[PDB]
């Protein structure tokens, strides 16, 4: 996996198909789920992190409205 | 449902503790005859 | 957990960037204040 | 009232019908309660 | 409380005049990889690590900018 | 057409074909109402 | 401009109608107090009913507020 | 396959230990912390994070969330664990 | 197999009494709600 | 019209007597019973029973517990386990027993024993309030 | 002599306790199953046909009930009745009571009997109490009094006219009436 | 300006509302295991409690909706709870989604009451012991009550969630505006905001439950 | 120009009348709580009455709202 | 015109008189719940009374409504 | 003219005052239900009182209507 | 020109306030029904109180009417 | 001559607020009837409490009335 | 000049809202009478609660009054 | 001119809405008195329920000041 690969041909060798990107997202979901949620004696952090990311997403599309309420001008 | 019924008691126990309290507050001129007239003697077998 | 001494290059970069930022902030503050007050007055 | 703008109404109807009638129900069908053992 | 200063007195302190040579050492090292183009032999792990360190020193520059304008949220004027 | 009809439609078939029929009529009515609402706008 | 003026006036009038939900919620929770004092072993179910009552009575008041906004913003 | 007994060692419920250990060698212990503080100050200093009513609604919901977690986390964890132990005990009784 | 490695299908195999009556109750939850 | 039978297991206070009003301390509150009062049946708590005769006179007793039954024919039956005229009780003993019961309440930690202590507390409180 | 002097206020009390069921006309359930039969006697003999009358009535009604399918549980107040009925009726027996006859009965005795009849876990549907009703110095007759349950007095259509009633007040009232009917039976049987 | 939080969100030009509406089920993982993690354990306990709460009053024909109504209360509640997070777009503030939830379900109940049940369906518009001279009016009332039921459902959910979010945003605006003024008043306004946040959590759950319960009662009157 | 203004004001005034339904629903469900605490054996029938009462009380409020709309949109 | 404008406003005002009928129906049905929890053997008679009470309260309300209409359409 | 406009508005306002009649009728008949459930032997006399109560509360509402028909048609 | 129009509007708004006396009379006579169904021996004194209560509640309503007749005619 | 018109309309509005005191006095004296029917031997203290409650409710009503008179005469 | 006119009208509209405090004080003291008739041994603590009720309900009414005055004199 | 006038009128009309909160607080605390006289052992639970009911009534009141301020300021 990447974090070891150091070639730009890796970027094009991957499977950028509908099923390929579907499998990528599914593998990411299962990596997160196995690391943080799917354990005995699990933590609420495995949830809150998700929520955090959610809020980040929620702030991304809200920035167009919020930038009209900046308190400075530059 | 009173507090003692939630605790599992009955009205026969409520009266016993309330009649005993009323007897305890009697001036001793009546107390002996009262607690002798109303005292229990039956034993459970 | 024992600390880790930061490489001198990162430390020098940290402090050089901090000082350059102090200079930049002062400079742009003194640059913007006149124009800012100018259009503040011109708006009224 | 942005809730009155009917231009973005299908964008609000179509995923819900997939979420309420397909995905949530497919996740509830996989939530099974077996019978107690003797 | 006090553990923060116990860690800061080792790495969150200004560079002593004795290690300013060592610093420039690494600096040339970096531009040396920019001299030839050998930086491609850096796997994306340490590449990401160096990018994080550079973002950190840029945040240092910006904190210097906010202490150089006497106001946190933008320019008060 | 595999997995989708195997892991999506076979489980939901008893409900989509027999239980939600009146729900399907109601969804038709709702779509009609929504069309007439977006028409007068 | 008389239309914006009457929009303000009608918004205030429409807002008047939340007194009913205030009073009805007072009634619901006072009756919760009473029915719980008379049978504290049903504390769960009684409370459930209270919730339901609240959620319905409050609803009516919000309808008023709805009209208020429809008058104030959506004309 | 059985389940592991612990998760991924998240700090503050937001950042895992992996980040701190990955940033430790080059910038020490307070490296990640000053990086986070510098990012926060650059965000709310160049109006990347605009302060509005949502700032205080966020503070309110975050305080309520942290309080609820710290107050009902041990209880919810013990409740789930005792549910699983009751199920395991009933199953081994039936065995 | 210990019950912490066990699947509901493995339990329906080990204790056939626990299998849900998908014919007497064709729809979820495949049992009486009071049984639940 | 009201025929009132007030009795203890060992003593009869009224037997078919014609009174006009009787105040009783039911476990669900106090109430006064006159003729044609709605039929009811209740159990008593420690307190004062004030019988109002047709003569305008009142007789005060202190019942401990028991039962009250008002019937459709205006016949009232009050049956007390321990009914005592107020001149047979003293205030000091009631107060001392109330103090003792409060102390053993602040001591006791079980649920039913504390229930019994509370019953004794409220009985002695009614006694104190009734004497004065 | 003393017993007959104490029987007058005790009779007023115990007969005023039963006035409700005579004015509301409670009729008892002919359908329910579980039954509780109480027999009042003393611990002393040389009394004539007192205990034998109680025993004959008790076993007669036990036969009549068990032939109808009801499961009957016996209570014997006094050692004599328990002794007479123990050998042939022990499978049907709940509790018995001692020290009856030496000292005259009090309301504390009835209260104790009512507690150990309530703290028994035997949720009876209906009961009867069999005592020796006193007529004169020469004659007495063995009488029966019914004992109703909470569900019998709650499900009665004639009780709809009694205001401010719920299951809790009816429970307390039925407990106190159990104590009262036991007291009345003890005061009638001692004379 | 003020209703900016109820406008259909877009990220780089795409309808992010689709992702926001599809996200809630992602938080309910399922498993075939007999004994599993804490999240699935607590969620299965909650789903069992909810099923027993909503479904016990129904007969064998209404209980066939156990999968539907439960899926309703699980879908709304989370959608409401996820709406309390900062800057979030709450789709239950939209009259669109709420109408599309209310009209199909209510229409399905009334149509399954008019397909079978038709004798008793038409009898239901008149209470049992209604006096004779009043039979007409009680049919004009019950009919329009039945005809407004779905709009009442949708508008109740929409108005309640939108009004809660508006009040929270306005109290946040008050806190921000009075931060540069008296601090004691600022902290008491923030305490009001905290009480309102707790109330809004409760209201999210209550509104999910009441929507589902009204749909359940409409189904019960037609089975 | 002024008739639309009066339509706004009249719609607000007409929707004031939902306070009565708010209060009536409060009363209905508070009395449901109390009557169920007094006799929890009738929980079904009692609840049924509540629904009926609610369905009638709310009805009146909707009347006002209808009139409000009939002033705001129809004329 | 100004007469039609005030006809709108007057109809909207007269429509507020239905809050009373709403609250009265709420009270009548809450009291039906309570009276049925007390004496469930009179379920018929009580319910009769209930409808009668309803039939009267709503009556007053509808008066207001027709008054509103008679301001809006008749004169 | 302005006077006929105000006559419409004042007639509507005056008609608002029938809400109290509606609520009072509801209270009277709900209490009749409860009192009949509690003491069904007094029914007749109870109904008597109810009538009286009704006849009084409605009377107040009537005065309101009178003032309405005093503003809209009389003066 | 406008002062008489506002006199009409204020007279209507003033006579609105009779709803309170209507509701209060309803409550007084409903409580008379209930308290008489409980203990009918007090029928005189109970009724006495009712009259008093009535005469007081209606009193408030009259005040409203008075100020109405103050705005409409005395000014 | 718009201040005079506004004083009329605002005085009518101000005196609307007496309905609350009317309903509150009705409630106080109805509860007096009920509490006297239950415990007719506390008649004097129950009447003292009734006098206090009526005094406070009428105090609120008279506050409304005096605000009305202040607007109408004292500006 | 219309500003002062609407200030008068808005002060009147605002002081309408003291009716709620009037009705609430009526309810509080009526329930005090009832609960004291049932349990006259709690005469002290009951009264305390009544005071608290009269302290809160009236407060709301007072709020309205201040708002009214805030419209009439300040802003 | 007329817009600020209507803003004042609408602010007053919107603050009318907390009368229902006042009445609901009265109802909650009266029922607290009643329930405490019934079962004086649940004083803590009854007071907790009363505080909850008071909070919800005042939330319904806040929903009216929300509109009272969205009219006076952020038109
Ligand atoms: C998405 C899920 C997925 O596909 O995998 C999840 C993945 C699985 O972990 P793994 O399979 O053990 O592999 C971990 C690494 O790939 C390999 O681990 P490693 O030890 O070789 O390298 C560690 C290094 C690898 O990643 C990096 O180089 C970090 C780059 C960050 C940009 O750092 C991290 O793993 C960072 C993870 C996220 C850190 C928190 C978010 C970024 C920083 C936050 C702001 C900065 C201040 C923080 C302190 C205050 O775990 C996570 O990403 C954690 C949950 C996501 C948290 C996001 C932040 C929430 C706020
Ligand atoms: C089904 C779910 C429940 C069962 C989950 C079971 C499981 O996985 O583990 C059991 C899990 C225990 O896991 P644990 O990590 O062993 O618990 C540690 C203790 O809580 C003790 O925790 P601690 O004191 O060691 O650490 C407290 C604190 C760390 O210290 C801090 O104060 C960090 C502050 C960072 C800023 O951590 C946090 O609270 C995280 C900070 C908040 C993150 C916010 C993210 C952005 C939004 O059970 C629970 O914690 C259950 C909590 C239930 C009550 C939460 C109520 C929160 C209020 C809700 C407000 C509305 C939310 C709206 C969004 C909702 C979206 C759905
Ligand atoms: C993005 C929003 C689209 C969500 C689509 C839902 C479709 C679905 O239900 O399939 C679920 C499915 C598992 O369903 P299950 O079999 O019932 O457990 O998981 C997936 O495959 C979803 C694939 C897309 C995942 C997008 C997120 C990728 C980063 C992972 C971080 C988020 C982890 C969330 C864990 C939270 C705690 C559980």
UniProtKB/Swiss-Prot annotation, chain A:
One of its GO terms (biological process) is proton motive force-driven mitochondrial ATP synthesis. Its main location: mitochondrion. The chain crosses the membrane at residues 49-66. Component of the ATP synthase complex composed at least of ATP5F1A/subunit alpha, ATP5F1B/subunit beta, ATP5MC1/subunit c (homooctomer), MT-ATP6/subunit a, MT-ATP8/subunit 8, ATP5ME/subunit e, ATP5MF/subunit f, ATP5MG/subunit g, ATP5MK/subunit k, ATP5MJ/subunit j, ATP5F1C/subunit gamma, ATP5F1D/subunit delta, ATP5F1E/subunit epsilon, ATP5PF/subunit F6, ATP5PB/subunit b, ATP5PD/subunit d, ATP5PO/subunit OSCP. Belongs to the ATPase F chain family. It comes from the Eukaryota. One of its GO terms (cellular component) is nuclear membrane. Keywords: Acetylation, ATP synthesis, CF(0), Hydrogen ion transport, Ion transport, Membrane, Mitochondrion, Mitochondrion inner membrane, Phosphoprotein, Transmembrane, Transmembrane helix, Transport. It is found in: Mitochondrion; Mitochondrion inner membrane. It is a single-pass membrane protein. The keyword Transport applies. The modification N6-acetyllysine is found at residue 3. This is ATP synthase F(0) complex subunit f, mitochondrial. The keyword Membrane applies.
Swiss-Prot record, chain B:
Ubiquitous. Transmembrane segments: none annotated. GO terms for cellular component: mitochondrial inner membrane; mitochondrial matrix; mitochondrion; proton-transporting ATP synthase complex. It is found in: Mitochondrion; Mitochondrion inner membrane. GO terms for molecular function: hydrolase activity; proton-transporting ATP synthase activity, rotational mechanism. The modification N6-succinyllysine is found at residues 20, 31, 36. It comes from the Eukaryota. Component of the ATP synthase complex composed at least of ATP5F1A/subunit alpha, ATP5F1B/subunit beta, ATP5MC1/subunit c (homooctomer), MT-ATP6/subunit a, MT-ATP8/subunit 8, ATP5ME/subunit e, ATP5MF/subunit f, ATP5MG/subunit g, ATP5MK/subunit k, ATP5MJ/subunit j, ATP5F1C/subunit gamma, ATP5F1D/subunit delta, ATP5F1E/subunit epsilon, ATP5PF/subunit F6, ATP5PB/subunit b, ATP5PD/subunit d, ATP5PO/subunit OSCP. This is ATP synthase F(1) complex subunit epsilon, mitochondrial.
From Swiss-Prot, chain D:
One of its GO terms (biological process) is proton motive force-driven mitochondrial ATP synthesis. It is found in: Mitochondrion membrane. It comes from the Eukaryota. One of its GO terms (cellular component) is proton-transporting ATP synthase complex. One of its GO terms (molecular function) is proton transmembrane transporter activity. It is a single-pass membrane protein. Its main location: mitochondrion. The chain crosses the membrane at residues 8-21. Keywords: Acetylation, ATP synthesis, Cardiomyopathy, CF(0), Disease variant, Hydrogen ion transport, Ion transport, Membrane, Mitochondrion, Primary mitochondrial disease, Transmembrane, Transmembrane helix, Transport. Belongs to the ATPase protein 8 family. Subunit 8, of the mitochondrial membrane ATP synthase complex (F(1)F(0) ATP synthase or Complex V) that produces ATP from ADP in the presence of a proton gradient across the membrane which is generated by electron transport complexes of the respiratory chain. ATP synthase complex consist of a soluble F(1) head domain - the catalytic core - and a membrane F(1) domain - the membrane proton channel. These two domains are linked by a central stalk rotating inside the F(1) region and a stationary peripheral stalk. This is ATP synthase F(0) complex subunit 8. It comes from Homo sapiens. The lineage of its organism: Eukaryota, Metazoa, Chordata, Craniata, Vertebrata. The chain holds residues 1 to 38 of 68 of the full protein.
UniProtKB/Swiss-Prot annotation, chains G, M, N, O, P, Q, R, S:
The record marks 58 as: Reversibly protonated during proton transport. Trimethylated by ATPSCKMT at Lys-43. Methylation is required for proper incorporation of the C subunit into the ATP synthase complex and mitochondrial respiration. Its main location: mitochondrion. It is a multi-pass membrane protein. The modification N6,N6,N6-trimethyllysine is found at residue 43. GO terms for biological process: proton motive force-driven ATP synthesis; proton transmembrane transport. The keyword Hydrolase does not apply. The keyword Methyltransferase does not apply. Keywords: CF(0), Hydrogen ion transport, Ion transport, Lipid-binding, Membrane, Methylation, Mitochondrion, Transit peptide, Transmembrane, Transmembrane helix, Transport. Subunit c, of the mitochondrial membrane ATP synthase complex (F(1)F(0) ATP synthase or Complex V) that produces ATP from ADP in the presence of a proton gradient across the membrane which is generated by electron transport complexes of the respiratory chain. ATP synthase complex consist of a soluble F(1) head domain - the catalytic core - and a membrane F(1) domain - the membrane proton channel. These two domains are linked by a central stalk rotating inside the F(1) region and a stationary peripheral stalk. This is ATP synthase F(0) complex subunit C1, mitochondrial.
């Amino acid at each position: 996996e990447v974090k070891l690969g150091e070639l730009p041909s890796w970027i094009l060798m991957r499977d950028f198909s509908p099923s390929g990107i579907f499998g990528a997202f599914q593998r990411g979901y299962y990596r997160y789920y196995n690391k943080y949620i799917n354990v005995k004696k699990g933590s609420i952090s495995g949830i809150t992190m998700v929520l955090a990311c959610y809020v980040l997403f929620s702030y991304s599309f809200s920035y167009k409205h919020l930038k009209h309420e900046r308190l400075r001008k530059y | 449902v009173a507090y003692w019924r939630q605790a599992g008691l009955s009205y026969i126990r409520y009266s016993q503790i309330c009649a005993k309290a009323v007897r305890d507050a009697l001036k001793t001129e009546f107390k002996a005859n009262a607690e002798k007239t109303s005292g229990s003697n039956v034993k459970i077998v | 957990v024992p600390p880790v001494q930061v490489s001198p290059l990162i430390k020098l970069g940290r402090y050089s960037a901090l000082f350059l930022g102090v200079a930049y902030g002062a400079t742009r503050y003194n640059y913007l204040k006149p124009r800012a007050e100018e259009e503040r007055r011109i708006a009224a | 009232m942005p809730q009155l703008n009917t231009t973005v109404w299908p964008t609000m109807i179509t995923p819900m019908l997939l979420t309420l009638f397909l995905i949530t129900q497919l996740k509830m069908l996989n939530t099974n309660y077996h019978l107690p053992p003797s | 409380l006090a553990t923060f200063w116990y860690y800061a007195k080792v790495e969150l302190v200004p560079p002593t005049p004795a290690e300013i040579p060592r610093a420039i050492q690494s600096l040339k090292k970096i531009v040396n990889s920019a001299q030839t183009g050998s930086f491609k032999q850096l796997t994306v792990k340490e590449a990401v690590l160096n990018g994080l360190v550079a973002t950190e020193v840029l945040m240092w520059f910006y904190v210097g900018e906010i202490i150089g304008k006497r106001g946190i949220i933008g320019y008060d004027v | 057409l595999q997995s989708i009809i195997k892991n999506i439609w076979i489980p939901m078939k008893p409900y989509y074909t027999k239980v939600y029929q009146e729900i399907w009529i109601g969804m038709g009515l709702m779509g009609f109402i929504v069309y007439k609402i977006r028409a007068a706008d | 401009d008389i239309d914006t003026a009457a929009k303000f006036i009608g918004a205030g009038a429409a807002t008047v109608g939340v007194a009913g939900s205030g009073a009805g919620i007072g009634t619901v929770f006072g009756s919760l107090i009473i029915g719980y004092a008379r049978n504290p072993s049903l504390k769960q179910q009684l409370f459930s009913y209270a919730i339901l009552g609240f959620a319905l009575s409050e609803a009516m008041g919000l309808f008023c507020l709805m009209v208020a906004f429809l008058i104030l913003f959506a004309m | 396959p059985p389940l592991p007994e612990y998760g991924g060692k998240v700090r503050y419920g937001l950042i895992p230990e992996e980040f701190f250990q990955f940033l430790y060698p080059k910038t020490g212990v307070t490296g990640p912390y000053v990086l986070g503080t510098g990012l926060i100050l650059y965000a709310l200093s160049k109006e990347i994070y605009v302060i509005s009513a949502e700032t205080f609604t966020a503070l309110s919901v975050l305080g309520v969330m942290v309080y609820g977690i710290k107050k009902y986390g041990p209880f919810v964890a013990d409740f789930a664990d005792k549910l699983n132990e009751q199920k395991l005990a009933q199953l081994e009784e039936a065995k | 197999i210990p019950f912490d490695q066990m699947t509901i299908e493995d339990l329906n195999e080990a204790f056939p009494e626990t299998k849900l009556d998908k014919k007497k109750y064709p729809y979820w939850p495949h049992q009486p709600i009071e049984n639940l | 019209q009201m025929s009132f039978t007030f009795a203890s297991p060992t003593q009869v206070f009224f037997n078919g007597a014609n009174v006009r009003q009787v105040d009783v301390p039911t476990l669900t509150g106090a109430f006064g019973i006159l003729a044609a009062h709605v039929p009811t049946l209740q159990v008593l708590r420690p307190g004062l029973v004030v019988v109002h005769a047709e003569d305008g006179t009142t007789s005060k007793y202190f019942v401990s517990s028991g039962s009250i039954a008002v019937n459709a024919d205006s016949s009232v039956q009050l049956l007390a386990e321990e009914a005592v005229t107020l001149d047979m009780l003293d205030l000091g003993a009631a107060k001392a027993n109330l103090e003792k019961a409060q102390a053993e309440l602040v001591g006791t930690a079980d649920e039913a024993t504390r229930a019994e202590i509370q019953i004794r507390i409220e009985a002695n409180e009614a006694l104190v309030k009734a004497l004065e | 002599a003393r017993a007959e002097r104490e029987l007058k206020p005790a009779r007023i009390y115990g007969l005023g306790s039963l006035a409700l069921y005579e004015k509301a006309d409670i009729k008892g359930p002919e359908d329910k199953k579980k039954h509780l039969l109480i027999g009042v006697s003393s611990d002393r003999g040389l009394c004539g046909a007192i205990h034998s009358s109680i025993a004959k009535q008790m076993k007669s009604e036990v036969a009549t009930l068990t032939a109808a399918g009801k499961e009957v549980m016996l209570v014997g107040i006094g050692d004599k009745i328990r002794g007479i009925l123990y050998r042939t009726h022990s499978d049907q027996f709940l509790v018995a009571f001692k020290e009856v006859g030496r000292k005259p009965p009090t309301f504390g005795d009835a209260s104790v009997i009512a507690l150990e009849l309530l703290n028994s876990g035997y949720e009876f549907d209906e009961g009867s109490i069999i005592f020796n009703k006193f007529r004169s110095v020469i004659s007495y007759k063995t009488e029966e009094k019914p004992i109703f349950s909470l569900n019998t007095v709650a499900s009665a259509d004639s009780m709809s006219i009694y205001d401010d009633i719920d299951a809790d007040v009816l429970q307390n009232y039925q407990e106190y009436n159990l104590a009262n009917i036991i007291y009345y039976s003890l005061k009638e049987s001692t004379t | 300006n003020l209703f900016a939080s109820f406008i259909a969100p877009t990220i780089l030009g795409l309808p992010a509302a689709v992702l926001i509406i599809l996200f809630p089920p992602l938080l309910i993982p399922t498993s075939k295991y007999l004994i599993n993690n804490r999240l699935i354990t607590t969620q299965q306990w909650l789903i069992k409690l909810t099923s027993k709460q909503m479904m016990t009053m129904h007969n064998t024909k209404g209980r066939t909706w156990s999968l539907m109504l439960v899926s309703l209360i699980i879908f709304i509640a989370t959608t409401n709870l996820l709406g309390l997070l900062p800057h979030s777009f709450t789709p239950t503030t939209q009259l669109s989604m709420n109408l599309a939830m209310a009209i199909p379900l209510w229409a399905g109940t009334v149509i399954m009451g008019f397909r079978s049940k038709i004798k008793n369906a038409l009898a239901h518009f008149l209470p049992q012991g209604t006096p004779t001279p009043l039979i007409p009016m009680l049919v004009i009332i019950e009919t329009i009550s039945l005809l407004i039921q779905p709009m009442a459902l949708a508008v109740r959910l929409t108005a309640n969630i939108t009004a809660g979010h508006l009040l929270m945003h306005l109290i946040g605006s008050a806190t921000l505006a009075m931060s540069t003024i008296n601090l004691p008043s600022t902290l008491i306004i923030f305490t009001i905001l905290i009480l309102l946040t707790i109330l809004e959590i409760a209201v999210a759950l209550i509104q999910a439950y009441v929507f589902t319960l009204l749909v359940s009662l409409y189904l019960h009157d037609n089975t």
